[PDB]
Curated annotation (Swiss-Prot):
Disulphide bridges: C2-C19, C9-C24, C18-C29
Domain comment (free text): The presence of a 'disulfide through disulfide knot' structurally defines this protein as a knottin.
Expression (tissue specificity): Expressed by the venom gland.
In-chain residues carrying the UniProt-annotated modification Valine amide: V33
Recorded family membership: Belongs to the neurotoxin 10 (Hwtx-1) family.
Protein's name according to its UniProt entry: U1-theraphotoxin-Pc1a
Organism superkingdom: Eukaryota
Job of this protein: Possesses strong antiplasmodial activity against the intra-erythrocyte stage of P.falciparum in vitro. IC(50) for inhibiting P.falciparum growth is 1.59 uM. Interacts with infected and healthy erythrocytes. Does not lyse erythrocytes, is not cytotoxic to nucleated mammalian cells, and does not inhibit neuromuscular function. Has neither antibacterial nor antifungal activity.
Localization terms from the record: Secreted
Amino acid sequence: ACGILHDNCVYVPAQNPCCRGLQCRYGKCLVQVS
């Protein structure tokens, strides 16, 4: 259960719980796409 593009999360990259490619923003894990 890696943090997804709309999975509530905090900006702690050091221990990124998200799927590699997504980055936690204070609130939700942002899909680091542009």
